[PDB]
Symmetry: D2
Subunit: 417 residues, 4 copies
């Protein structure tokens, strides 16, 4: 009755989505947004993936914990994720938390409300990552292994493993050693090029988690963080187990590598968006069997019109969302979000244009990210002069330019934000 254990498991589970992430490494992109509220994929926000994974996994009871610049995130939840009939034991609960002087503390603050859920299993999720996963499969593995805490894990390049918690496991996926964000990451025994990293995705026995949080709240030596404090304590007790991500990762092509993006840097964010514009994207957004939902506005179809000279337009490996109006121009390796306006004689290459961007005539944009509702003045060139770009806007080490409404205003260009 693995199908019975399957169904009965999400029904006794509650998902807690940590959506307080500041996303500091994203620079001005998160100055007035929480990282889970960051735009992605032309019409989505990052938090939509964790929420959609819960729905598709059979977990219809969700608690979204927020802490940093929460308005746009709350509004998004209100407009796209408030379709539930709570009498049927399904809901998306907004659980605000206050900054106190870690991730476990935000859950501890809302512990009274979470206890009233009367859940047997608690699924802890990071709401600022992009991935597809069937949490019901992880729940089964958690129960079959008899674990008190199950941590989703995945091999990552060792040069990037210092940003994660790194672990070493048993013959029966039991965690033996755990270190949080090591400067010198231990490598996997079968492969020195990779480290076994924690994905920030946990399954907990509910009663055990409550006791653990109560003890952690009373501990004066703790930073009240899941990775830095709780997971090592559970590992030392021998009650923590690991869950290989390929067991539950949802992907159309089974021969491909498991998709998971933390979207930590501006370059990684720019890279992840343009992946969807490529011929064969690593992330499949056309899968009807694991759909990602979001707030769907009644935008008009993407409109392509002749330029002022009556000439046509060209498009190469690009995404154009609804409500856009493009006058001829050249759009290459770019992702245009909703209601983006591109005027005549423009050249847009390897660019990410967030919703409501207005691009003036005769502009050239290369290897850049244009923030929401930016009004680009006629003739502006971006991505061709490294020194001039760094003066006017933010320019990353890799050469990716970020443009913001405040930046354009300081330059004297009028803008309606």
């Amino acid at each position: 009755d693995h199908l019975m254990l399957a169904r009965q498991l999400p029904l006794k589970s509650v998902a807690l989505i940590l959506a307080g992430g500041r996303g500091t490494r994203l620079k001005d992109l998160t100055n007035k947004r929480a990282k889970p509220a960051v735009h992605f994929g032309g019409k989505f926000r990052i938090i939509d993936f964790a929420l959609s994974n819960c729905i598709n996994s059979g977990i219809r009871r969700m608690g979204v914990i927020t802490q940093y610049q929460s308005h746009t995130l709350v509004q998004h939840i209100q407009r796209g994720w408030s379709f539930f009939n709570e009498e049927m034991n399904e809901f998306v609960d907004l659980l605000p938390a206050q900054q106190r002087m870690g991730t476990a503390d935000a859950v501890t603050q809302n512990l009274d409300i979470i206890r009233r859920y009367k859940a047997e299993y608690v699924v802890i999720l990071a709401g600022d990552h992009i991935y597809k996963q069937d949490y019901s499969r992880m729940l089964i593995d958690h129960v079959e292994k008899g674990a008190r805490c199950t941590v989703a894990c995945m091999p990552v390049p060792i040069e990037e493993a210092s940003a994660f918690g790194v672990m070493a496991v048993d013959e029966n996926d039991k965690i033996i050693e755990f270190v949080e964000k090591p400067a010198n990451p231990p490598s996997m025994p079968n492969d020195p090029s990779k480290s076994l990293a924690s994905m920030g995705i946990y399954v907990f026995d509910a009663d055990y988690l409550y006791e653990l949080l109560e003890e952690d709240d009373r501990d004066e030596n703790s930073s009240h963080d899941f990775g830095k404090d709780l997971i090592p304590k559970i590992t030392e007790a021998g009650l923590a187990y690991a869950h290989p991500f390929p067991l539950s990762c949802v992907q159309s092509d089974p021969d491909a590598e498991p998709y998971w993006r933390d979207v930590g840097t501006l370059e990684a964010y720019w890279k992840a968006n343009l992946d969807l514009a490529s011929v064969v994207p690593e992330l499949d957004m056309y899968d009807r069997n694991w759909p990602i939902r979001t707030y769907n506005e009644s935008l008009p179809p993407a409109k392509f019109v002749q330029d002022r000279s009556g000439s046509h337009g060209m498009t190469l490996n690009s995404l154009v969302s609804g409500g856009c109006v493009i006058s001829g121009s050249v759009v290459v390796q770019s992702v245009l979000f909703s209601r983006v306006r591109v005027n005549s004689f423009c050249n847009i290459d390897s660019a990410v244009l967030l919703p409501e961007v207005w691009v003036g005539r005769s502009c050239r944009l290369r290897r850049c990210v244009i923030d929401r509702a930016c009004v680009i003045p006629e003739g502006m060139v971006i991505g061709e002069n490294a020194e001039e770009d760094a003066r006017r806007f933010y320019r990353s080490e890799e050469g990716i330019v970020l443009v913001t409404r405040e930046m354009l205003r300081k330059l004297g260009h009028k803008q309606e934000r």
Copy 2:
């Protein structure tokens, strides 16, 4: 303006959505005409419904008799967002005047003071609240929206002649020899199939019509002449309530009766300055919004780019290079490499094989065009394989292609 707001609140809109739309040929064989796709992501009935919402009339009765499911499903998915305790609803009333008479018990329980009769198979923007005001101020029992139409096309409408101040003196339904307006012999004053009724008066009229005698049970053929003869019918000029961004332009209203007119009306939205404004936030048209992916443009098999000239590309589409000119592509349309698409309307889920050329045509839903097919260049070959109109517009359907040998599985 106080009269304005309190007027739609005491009003109920009845939308006749049983239209067969036979003049659209195979396009309406498996759909009712109000369920016909339009504008890349809409159905025709969305305009009448949106006009009601934007006019303050939130109580609607949609009468459906023909090709019900796809229309009913559309209402379910996109027009079932109401809280009926707040006196707002869209009521599915399975069953022109007879269709209203059949549901007279349910309609009476609405307890409406005014009844707005609408045709659900026309494309237009109108503020019904303005027509309601004109109906009350004129003291009329029945008010008929009217508009001048070319006299050579007036035989398809109910033609009227008005008194000094917009009364109804003479009315004839679909005359073979249409009377010309006295102020202009070039155009006849035509009825738009849009009526405002005093509710109690309409109920009595329908009761009488049911009991006698040899009537066609039709609004235009039977009811309107009877009201005109009684002297209780008045006319409402459409420009008084027509909603349009440019006030200097002509009033927009399309009955979408023939394949050519349907093909023409869709491509208007792809032009630089469309006659129909679908970007007006002050009079929005709502519909069922799926979570389609952004329109995707990819290089063709040869790594070459694609070209687009005055075209609409809906969500979920994937276009590999190719040339798209003066065309409207509906949802989930797949266009493969080396294609040339010109002045074409491609309904949802159309799959266009490689190296195809489509010109001046309408491709029906989910058609699988085989590799290399050419349409719109050989008149005799087009007429053999598919339907070809007198004006040269080609309609392609999955059954036509199946009889042609290439399967659509």
Copy 3:
């Protein structure tokens, strides 16, 4: 989990309910009011939701306006992009003869093109005119484990009532050996002569197998195109049909109790099933938060109890009073009052079912009756005390249960204008 996800529920909601007399004159039986605030179809639909089956096709035929409107109001909250929906599937009355009506299977066959596009692996066939709680996910598991092509939910019923159902006989392996539809002399169970093993009209099908079966049945000129009369015997003869004991999946708080299932076939049974909820210990538990029954919820005011005209109290004994009701004193005993029921002063209401919006005039006495929706009872009327007078004015069942409708009251000269 993966089992309900690959399933689609088809709810047959075209039931005439002729044995309910005027109660189904202007509505289909699945649209019949029940429990003070519900309609009968709400149970099958809620069972689907609670079982994890969020893809539903409601097949409607007879008097469907109020049923469709109910679906529109209370069961149109789905995000279809997430593979969840309640689909309205109208079906037309077709006849295989001069007086030969096509049956339940034909209604599904008519919508076979739409149902195929669901791309379901399993099809759950449900009757939308019965009142019960069942976890279909458990039945799906039993269907797969038994390797069956068709699984039929079954339950022992009193043999004197078994002529209304299909009656079966099974293996120790649980395969159906014999099946007879609506026998006038129902075969008794081997372990018990007082009971017959009855079919509950609830089936689980392998989707591809069902499609083939319906295609063949559509081309068969000797078939009445009915699940019970035609398909089930054919599957039984082929040896591909198995039985599912209802207690395996029946949802009930008290495990020591008997499985609850009511077909609500007659006026007396309908009256009886409603009053059960008013008793001290109802057989049907409507207070279970773990298997809730949802319906169209209107923002009714709380039930209002006011003094009568003489300023006296009101008295209530084992009764249900729904929202929007206003009761002026009076005595209400063993009764169920639906939404917006108005009971005026000096009334005595005993063992009565009052459907929504009923207006009871002053000094009325109602006993052992069912009052249809929006009836306006005139001042001083007495019902349920004079058998012959009751039968003259209204409908009176063999057991003495009276049914009152607005049309009956109008023929008597009592205005119903509201």
Copy 4:
């Protein structure tokens, strides 16, 4: 009609409701239960819907979870593509609006309607909008005569229908010139020209912050403020009656307003289909009345019994029972307000009291008969109204879990 379409309603729902004592412990005042199945904020929200204003911004600041949850479950049915929404805007009263000025500007509204979310009343805001435009005012303030002995709690004004003088919460309230027994009071309901309000808030933010204490006097001095008599827009079935408006400030007033709905002719009409009040509607079972342990019937006199309730015989008089309230056998309940999920043990007597949500009253407890004993165990107001809370009962040794 075109006036509400260019309008956006901002509902101030941060009220702490201090004068309600433990009733607002762990609750915002707009989230306080009322009418058996409603919360106080439902009236302002329903008024907006029925007035044609379908764009609403709810500003919340104090103990906001239960209020936010209520908005999520009962007021999240909007299709925002059609320019209709209820937005949660976490944040003096003017500062809360100023903090969210960026989001509010993006609404692109022409008129802003400012509402207090902790009052109970029925009003057609569209009529006030018309009066605002016809008078050519920049700010319109809804006003109503109140008894002068209670006028110190309101902003008091005088008018020529243009503002003249204003004073926020005066200890010595000026009486109306035509009648010394009353004072013309502000109802905390304003209509603003949107662009003008934004400029005013910008200036106020830079001035080294309550609508009544700061902004309204400044607008009055400028001569740009006008008054709107409440009877012009108040919605009421009986036109001969007095305009209904309750601030529900004290425990006694809260207890009084609830019991009004239980009377034979309530001052507040909740049966008007033309101006309905919506709320979160759970699929509760019908109110259940069963025989008591002795097989005896139950008695009810002028009382409201909400869904999910189960009453075992007992006598319920002049009381309002909220959802899922259990009353066991042999109980006597008189002039009492029982909030949701209250469990009343057998043989209890409750009189002139308010029982907070989910209280578990132990068998035999008597409340409302001994003043000194009531004041020792619970809170007792000056008028003799008793408030019972789960914490109070647990301090006395009576277990509440459940």
